[PDB]
Design an enzyme around this catalytic site. Structure first.
Site, mmCIF file in Angstrom:
data_model
loop_
_atom_site.group_PDB
_atom_site.id
_atom_site.type_symbol
_atom_site.label_atom_id
_atom_site.label_comp_id
_atom_site.label_asym_id
_atom_site.label_seq_id
_atom_site.Cartn_x
_atom_site.Cartn_y
_atom_site.Cartn_z
ATOM 1 N N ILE A 30 20.813 10.239 -14.826
ATOM 2 C CA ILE A 30 19.690 10.901 -15.547
ATOM 3 C C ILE A 30 19.596 10.325 -16.962
ATOM 4 O O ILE A 30 18.665 10.716 -17.648
ATOM 5 C CB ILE A 30 19.810 12.448 -15.563
ATOM 6 C CG1 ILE A 30 21.172 12.955 -16.036
ATOM 7 C CG2 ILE A 30 19.463 13.043 -14.196
ATOM 8 C CD1 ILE A 30 21.308 14.476 -16.006
ATOM 9 N N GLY A 31 20.495 9.432 -17.380
ATOM 10 C CA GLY A 31 20.554 8.998 -18.789
ATOM 11 C C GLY A 31 21.481 7.818 -19.002
ATOM 12 O O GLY A 31 22.459 7.684 -18.266
ATOM 13 N N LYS A 32 21.181 7.002 -20.008
ATOM 14 C CA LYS A 32 21.985 5.811 -20.379
ATOM 15 C C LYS A 32 21.809 5.575 -21.885
ATOM 16 O O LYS A 32 20.749 5.946 -22.437
ATOM 17 C CB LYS A 32 21.581 4.631 -19.489
ATOM 18 C CG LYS A 32 22.113 3.275 -19.924
ATOM 19 C CD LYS A 32 22.142 2.234 -18.808
ATOM 20 C CE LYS A 32 23.504 2.029 -18.169
ATOM 21 N NZ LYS A 32 23.430 2.109 -16.689
ATOM 22 N N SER A 34 24.307 3.697 -25.626
ATOM 23 C CA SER A 34 25.400 2.836 -26.148
ATOM 24 C C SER A 34 26.726 3.413 -25.675
ATOM 25 O O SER A 34 27.588 2.621 -25.290
ATOM 26 C CB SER A 34 25.361 2.726 -27.654
ATOM 27 O OG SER A 34 24.254 1.941 -28.051
ATOM 28 N N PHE A 35 26.826 4.742 -25.700
ATOM 29 C CA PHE A 35 28.031 5.554 -25.377
ATOM 30 C C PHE A 35 28.460 5.353 -23.914
ATOM 31 O O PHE A 35 29.670 5.491 -23.637
ATOM 32 C CB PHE A 35 27.737 7.041 -25.592
ATOM 33 C CG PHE A 35 26.651 7.607 -24.697
ATOM 34 C CD1 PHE A 35 25.310 7.529 -25.054
ATOM 35 C CD2 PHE A 35 26.963 8.197 -23.474
ATOM 36 C CE1 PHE A 35 24.317 8.030 -24.214
ATOM 37 C CE2 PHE A 35 25.972 8.702 -22.643
ATOM 38 C CZ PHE A 35 24.648 8.610 -23.009
ATOM 39 N N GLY A 36 27.495 5.122 -23.011
ATOM 40 C CA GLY A 36 27.707 5.140 -21.548
ATOM 41 C C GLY A 36 26.533 5.769 -20.816
ATOM 42 O O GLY A 36 25.359 5.450 -21.170
ATOM 43 N N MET A 105 23.334 21.851 -17.437
ATOM 44 C CA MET A 105 22.117 21.085 -17.095
ATOM 45 C C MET A 105 20.975 21.729 -17.876
ATOM 46 O O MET A 105 20.827 22.940 -17.771
ATOM 47 C CB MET A 105 21.818 21.185 -15.598
ATOM 48 C CG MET A 105 20.694 20.304 -15.121
ATOM 49 S SD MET A 105 21.131 18.562 -15.299
ATOM 50 C CE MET A 105 19.682 17.792 -14.578
ATOM 51 N N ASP A 152 20.790 12.446 -35.780
ATOM 52 C CA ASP A 152 19.829 11.728 -34.891
ATOM 53 C C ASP A 152 18.869 12.729 -34.290
ATOM 54 O O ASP A 152 18.581 12.627 -33.084
ATOM 55 C CB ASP A 152 20.538 10.855 -33.845
ATOM 56 C CG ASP A 152 19.628 9.799 -33.215
ATOM 57 O OD1 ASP A 152 18.569 9.472 -33.817
ATOM 58 O OD2 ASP A 152 19.971 9.334 -32.137
#
Length: 341
Positions: A30-32, A34-36, A105, A152
């Site tokens: 569901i997400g990407k 820099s962290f992973g 979630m 951020d």
């Protein structure tokens, strides 16, 4: 690569349908970042959906995530109901050499919600609901024991609890820190970046209130208030709206001369790079205070009066104070007449 579990980016190679520790069924990515990566997973033991943030198998990312875990546990443990504006970290564990943060979630982010309006914005009433929640979140973060700077804030880092309600939470404390020896770093996403950070000055919790002012105007208009292509364009777009920053700020700013010229009398003006002259792009005109709201689209709608828009404008101008010292603080934002209903 990590017994064949990792790609050449130190990311876990996600397999839809994989089961972990006889407990979690990985549904999808569901997400990407820099962290992973972030995956949706069904927790068979608790009988609920969770978001698992899979940190890259690299020391620097693992160490940053241990800071993120520490801040989330600090916040999640506080004895106030204000903590429910912050995403809940359920637990964390080490799995196949990746640190995994297990979150509740949540739903769509406020950027998804803007995409759903076709970038024409949500009503002033829904803007007010989001504003009240975010001001309460920032009131919480500025609790002395916490003193957490998110660093951020942006529509993508504010998530609806669910697609049906106006309830929201802040996510992604991966770049966050506690107020400390004040230091400059190149932080915040450019459109939401405070003038003190643009100017190379040390930052405090006020940088989050600047980001909030920008976010709230965008939520109502449908578009970023200050969409800079680079830092010079970013500062020039801020000056179009707010005029030249005070001399007492620029006199102390290490990067003042990236954007501004000091004249023989000690006054400052924009450097030559085009742009509207300073202060000509009024928030009064961006919000359509006297002309039916953004692009005139709120003409004769309930709770979109000149008086309502004047109160919104006044709150945003106090959030977009160039001076981080006099920028409105969360408690006083919450007492603003814009919230008097």
């Amino acid at each position: 690569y990590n017994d064949g579990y990792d790609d050449d980016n130190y990311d876990y190679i996600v397999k839809n349908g994989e089961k972990w520790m006889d407990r979690y069924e990985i549904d999808s990515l569901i997400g990407k970042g820099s962290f992973g990566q972030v995956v949706k997973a069904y927790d068979r033991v608790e009988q609920e959906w969770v978001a698992i943030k899979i940190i890259k198998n690299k020391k620097a990312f693992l160490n940053q995530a241990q800071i993120e875990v520490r801040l989330l546990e600090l916040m999640n443990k506080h004895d106030t109901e204000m903590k429910y504006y912050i995403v809940h970290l359920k637990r964390h564990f080490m799995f196949r050499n990746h640190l995994c943060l297990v979150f509740e979630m949540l739903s769509y982010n406020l950027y998804d919600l803007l995409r759903n309006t076709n970038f024409r914005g949500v009503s002033l009433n829904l803007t007010r609901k989001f504003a009240q929640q975010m001001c309460t979140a920032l009131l919480f973060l500025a609790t002395p024991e916490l003193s957490i700077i998110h660093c951020d804030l942006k529509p993508e880092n504010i998530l609806l609890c669910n697609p049906k309600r106006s309830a929201i939470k802040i996510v992604d404390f991966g770049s966050s820190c506690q107020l400390g020896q004040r230091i400059y770093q190149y932080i915040q996403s450019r459109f939401y970046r405070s003038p003190e950070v643009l100017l190379g000055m040390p930052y405090d919790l006020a940088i989050d209130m600047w980001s909030l002012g920008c976010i709230l105007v965008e939520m109502h208009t449908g578009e970023p208030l200050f969409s800079g292509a680079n830092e010079v364009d970013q500062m020039n777009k801020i000056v179009e709206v707010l005029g030249i920053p005070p001399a007492h700020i620029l006199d102390q700013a290490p990067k003042a001369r990236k954007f501004f010229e000091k004249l023989p009398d000690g006054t400052w003006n924009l450097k030559k790079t085009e742009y509207k002259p300073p202060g000509t792009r009024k928030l009064h005109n961006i919000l359509g205070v006297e002309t039916g709201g953004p692009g005139g689209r709120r003409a004769g709608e309930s709770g979109h009066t000149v008086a309502d828009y004047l109160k919104f404008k006044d709150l945003i101008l106090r959030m977009l104070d160039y001076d981080p010292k006099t920028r409105i603080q969360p408690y006083y934002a919450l007492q603003h007449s814009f919230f008097k209903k």
